Structures are given as structure tokens and as C-alpha cells.
Amino acid sequence: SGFRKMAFPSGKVEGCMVQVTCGTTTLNGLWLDDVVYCPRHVICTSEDMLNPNYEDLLIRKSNHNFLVQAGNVQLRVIGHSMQNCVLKLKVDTANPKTPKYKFVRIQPGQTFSVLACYNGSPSGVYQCAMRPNFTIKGSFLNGSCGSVGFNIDYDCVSFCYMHHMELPTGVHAGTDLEGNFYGPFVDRQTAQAAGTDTTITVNVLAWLYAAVINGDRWFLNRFTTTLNDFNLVAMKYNYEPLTQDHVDILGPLSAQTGIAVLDMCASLKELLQNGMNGRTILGSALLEDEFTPFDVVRQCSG
Amino acid sequence: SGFRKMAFPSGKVEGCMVQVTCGTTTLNGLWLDDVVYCPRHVICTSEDMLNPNYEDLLIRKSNHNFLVQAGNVQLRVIGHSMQNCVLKLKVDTANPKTPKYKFVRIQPGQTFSVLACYNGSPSGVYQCAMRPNFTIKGSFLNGSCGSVGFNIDYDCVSFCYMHHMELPTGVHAGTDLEGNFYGPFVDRQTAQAAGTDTTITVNVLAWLYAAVINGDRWFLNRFTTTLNDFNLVAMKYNYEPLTQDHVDILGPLSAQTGIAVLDMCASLKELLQNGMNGRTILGSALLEDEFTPFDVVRQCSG
Numbered sequence A, B: 001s002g003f004r005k006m007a008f009p010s011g012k013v014e015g016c017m018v019q020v021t022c023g024t025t026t027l028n029g030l031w032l033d034d035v036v037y038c039p040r041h042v043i044c045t046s047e048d049m050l051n052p053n054y055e056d057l058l059i060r061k062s063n064h065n066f067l068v069q070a071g072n073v074q075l076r077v078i079g080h081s082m083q084n085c086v087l088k089l090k091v092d093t094a095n096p097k098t099p100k101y102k103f104v105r106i107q108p109g110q111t112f113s114v115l116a117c118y119n120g121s122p123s124g125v126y127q128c129a130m131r132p133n134f135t136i137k138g139s140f141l142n143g144s145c146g147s148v149g150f151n152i153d154y155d156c157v158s159f160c161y162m163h164h165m166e167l168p169t170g171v172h173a174g175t176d177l178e179g180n181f182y183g184p185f186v187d188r189q190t191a192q193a194a195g196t197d198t199t200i201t202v203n204v205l206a207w208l209y210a211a212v213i214n215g216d217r218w219f220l221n222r223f224t225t226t227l228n229d230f231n232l233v234a235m236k237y238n239y240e241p242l243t244q245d246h247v248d249i250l251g252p253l254s255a256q257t258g259i260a261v262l263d264m265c266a267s268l269k270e271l272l273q274n275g276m277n278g279r280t281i282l283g284s285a286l287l288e289d290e291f292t293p294f295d296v297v298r299q300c301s302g
């Protein structure tokens, strides 16, 4: 037992991290096969970020202006191109450590592991969710751009995120590996609103099921509710509406604990309206929404 | 910015994980050079755990009874010995992926990353602390024994923990890599008390400094206190007494934020006595104590 915010083992991704420098700007790149993927803002100066014309800025760059280093060895850049907000630097050597991989555009409410890197060197790994407002609550400092988010399915790494920027609320924005930002964000220095940070209801319910599997059962009540009644309370607390598809997704956890999904909704409705009363659930004093039903099942069964 | 429970990149440790089977028992081993380290309870049946005589049980085992598998390849066991609560299985092949390493016995209040493994395959990585009561709050299921805890200092892995068991409170107990348990725990099926789970005060203060660096400043007040006055309140809440050595350790964070250590103690005293009033600090509704002052500096500077 026990329940922690667990990340995937990062080894497969560590073997893909390189340093990319253009002028005075250094950030991280992801080396897969003979291509290095990195944020296109590597070509920008601080002044350029106020109103960058990436097409015009990129024309002043040649292959030899992109310095790519893998550990202590320099890679030779034989091509470059921009795809949405990422650059693809073709190198003359295929990464010998390229794992089996896919590029996926993750859905809001889903989770992934981030390997935070600086100067092409991995520094830490943590788990996060793609919030409904398409931001992540990461931990990224100066030089972290190009760090990636991923999931692992046995031996295949599904890359889903590349880090590009930090927004005014302290939250982070980035793209999928095709260079398309998650959400309405743009790689420019303009204050950008993420919008209401709604709570991932199905994930809160999954985490309440994890708590029950772990013996934390104080919050269970003798009540039930309906989807429509629960959602009237969910709306008030900026929780995502719970759908029948979410109920179906919670099926296995509901059956494992013997607690019907709508009975768990009634418990969550009471927790929202009355609070925790100074009590905790799985070592937390707030309702946690960054664990999917898959994450809970994986962590509670193997 | 941002502050997450961040673990070290696990790649170096993933290359050391093997599966060890003895009879019907399978768990994980740590393969470093030509030795595989694993919990000695791998030799036990469920019945043996009620009152095991490890010396007598181990005499009925020969090298060929320990099946060690590294991925899909079987390693040849050419020796075995017991050191405290670990077995050391000498194999005929040195692990080609053996990183630079040390075995360290971590101090209570310090943190480390755990690579949770099952059947010799890494499943997840998370960060935790060696609690003052020498337990960890991990996430470990059946088959997780032999998973290790470690820290990384550039290219050197300091192994500090090997997983052995789960206690009645849902917390975990284990040994250093010399096989000595942290705390009073024994590898037998008897209900074992961990004692009062005291809060790591210096770590709470480090985390309050992290919150201030991250713009969360609501809890700062116009007060100061003394070590002796603060400790009178700390005792009441089962917090560890704050010493001058802890104040010295918080020196760099105090100076970075311009908030004197005793001024931060006054804020923590008010948080303990009055609560959070429904507010959060770094996305938490309770005072977090599993980040050391080193962890905060590393995550806030690089």
C-alpha cells in the first residue's frame, strides 16, 4: 500500500536529452533517430520575444548556427526546419539510445512524467497532469525549455509535451512534439490568460477510490446522488461535469472497493460542501485531481 | 518557478535492477559489480516469517537455489552470504551498467528517490524522506521488496535504502545497503510500532522559504520569535526541536528571501496555532516536511 505522485522511470528519456545552443541561447533538445527537436524560441534574443517573426528570424540561421551537444560530443547539423513552434535539426548521427517511441497529443485530464533538464542534462523527474485549461503545474527554471513530458507503455515512450514557457500564474505552457501548443498559448512575451483552472472531477473520484483501497475511509457517508445533482454542486466549485463516460471509466475502481460511482459522488459532494474538517486523505488536506483512474489502478495493482 | 516533489532521474539505477527468486518467492535485487544485494527474507515462506531463524533457513540454500535474472538473461550465482538483513549473491558477471556508487546510511530528515520495481523491472520513481521515526511513506505493493532508495551527486549514485516491509500504519521499513534496518524494525511478522511520526521542522521551514521564492507570501506576518519560544509551540505539535545547526542550515534560504529564520519561525508558529484558514501554500493545504533545505535550493536555483 501507499499512494504517491509517481513518475515513470526516466532512463529511456535521459538517453535522448541533448543541449541546443543558438547564439547566446542554450536550451534542451530531444534527439530521436537523426533529428533533434527543440523549441523554436531558441533562435530568439530576449528583445525578439516581445514580437517575434519566427519565419524572418529563422532565415538568418544556418545549420552551423545550431550547436547540438550530446554529453561532451558535438553533433553535426545537416538540416533544419520549423514545424509549428518546434525546430527539427537533422543531425548526421542517429541517436544510438533511441527507444521505441510515439508522438501523442495528450487529452486534458491525462497525466504524464516530466524529465526536467538544464544544459541537456536531466535534473529531476516528476508527474503532472495536462490541466483542463491546457496548462501544467510544473517546476521549471531558466534553461528548462525543451524538457519533455512522456508516458511509457512497457518499452514504448509516448512523448506528449515539450516545455516552452511560464505564464503569469506560475503555471507552464508547451507544445506536443509536432510543435502545436496545448491551449491558446503563443511563444511571445505577452501576458496570456490560462482561464479558469477547473478541477478534474473524474481524477478526484479516482483518488478517493485510491484512498479507500488504502484504508482511508472516514469521508464515506450513507448517501448517494445522481449525475445531474452531483454536477449542480460540481459547477459551483469549478469542477468538470461528470459524464456517463467518466462513470464507465471509474467502473473497475467502483467494483474493486464495492462503492458505487454515484455513492462516491455523494461523498465528494459532502467533502466539497463541508470541507475536510482538519482531516486528511492520503496525506493531503485538499482534493487531489492529478491521478487518472489508470494511474490509481496501476499504483494499487501493479 | 514551480515546486514539485521531484525525484532524481532513475536511469543509472534502472540499469542495476534484477529479479531474484528463491523457491516460490520473487523480489528485486540490486546488481552492482559482481554482487546482487537483496532482502534476506527472499529465503522465507509465508509461514517462516512468523518466527524466522535466518541462519538456519539460509543453511538449506545453495547457490543454485537463488535464481537471478537480469532482463531476459539468467546470471550464474557463484557465492552467497548474509550481511545483517541483506543477502549478497556473488555472480560470475559484473554488471556492465554499474554506475559510480556509494552505500550511505542516511540521516533522519533527509530525502531520497525510490525506484519502485516488480519482478526486477522498474515501475515508477518518487521522492520521499527518511522520517524522524525511521519509516518512509512509500508506495509499495506485493513484490516491491528489494526496490532501492538513492540520491545522485553528478554521476555518483548514493544508495541509502532497500525496501523490506510494510508496517501496520501503512508506512514502510527497510535497511541501508549493509542490511541494517533504519529504526527498530525487524524482518519478522510481528506488529511493530514506529512511534510518534514527528514533523521535520527544518524541512517545513525550508518549504515555507520555497513558497516565498515562488510568490506565495500570504502567511508572512509582522512578528518574530526566539528558538526557545518557537520550540515551546513545536513540542505541542510533535514538531522536531529547531536547533542552531538547523538555523545555520537555513542561512542561505533566509538570505535569498530576506526573511530571518526566526521571522519565518514566527510565521510557522502562527500557521500551527491558527491553521491555513482554507488557504494553500505551494498547492498544499498542510505544512510539507519532505523537502530539505538542499532540495529547496536545488529546485529553486538549479
Ligand SMILES: COc1ccccc1NC1CN(C(=O)c2cc(=O)[nH]c3ccccc23)C1
Residues within 6 Å of the ligand: A041, A046, A049, A140, A141, A142, A143, A144, A145, A164, A165, A166, A172, A187, A188, A189, A190, B001
Ligand atoms: C523572454 O523570454 C520568453 C518570452 C516568452 C516566451 C518564452 C520566453 N523564454 C523562454 C522561457 N524560458 C525559460 O528559460 C523559462 C522557462 C520556465 O518555465 N520558467 C522560467 C522562469 C524564469 C526564467 C526562465 C524560465 C526561455
Ligand SMILES: COc1ccccc1NC1CN(C(=O)c2cc(=O)[nH]c3ccccc23)C1
Residues within 6 Å of the ligand: A164, A165, A166, A167, A168, A169, A188, A189, A190, A191, A192, B001
Ligand atoms: C510570467 O509570464 C508572463 C508575464 C507577462 C508577460 C509575458 C509572460 N509570459 C512569457 C512566457 N515567459 C517566460 O517563460 C519567462 C521568460 C523569462 O525570461 N523569464 C521569466 C520569469 C518568470 C516567469 C516567466 C518567465 C514570459
Ligand SMILES: COc1ccccc1NC1CN(C(=O)c2cc(=O)[nH]c3ccccc23)C1
Residues within 6 Å of the ligand: A001, B041, B046, B049, B140, B141, B142, B143, B144, B145, B164, B165, B166, B172, B187, B188, B189, B190
Ligand atoms: C508475511 O510476509 C512478511 C512478513 C514480515 C516481513 C516481510 C514480509 N514479506 C515481505 C514484505 N513484502 C511485500 O511484498 C510487500 C511489501 C510492502 O511494502 N507492502 C506489501 C503490501 C502487500 C503485500 C506485500 C507487500 C514481502
Ligand SMILES: COc1ccccc1NC1CN(C(=O)c2cc(=O)[nH]c3ccccc23)C1
Residues within 6 Å of the ligand: A001, B164, B165, B166, B167, B168, B169, B188, B189, B190, B191, B192
Ligand atoms: C501491516 O504490518 C503488520 C501487521 C501485523 C503484523 C506484522 C506486520 N508487519 C509485517 C511486515 N509485513 C509486510 O510487509 C506484509 C507482508 C504481506 O505478506 N502482506 C502485507 C499486507 C499488508 C501490509 C503488509 C504486508 C507484515
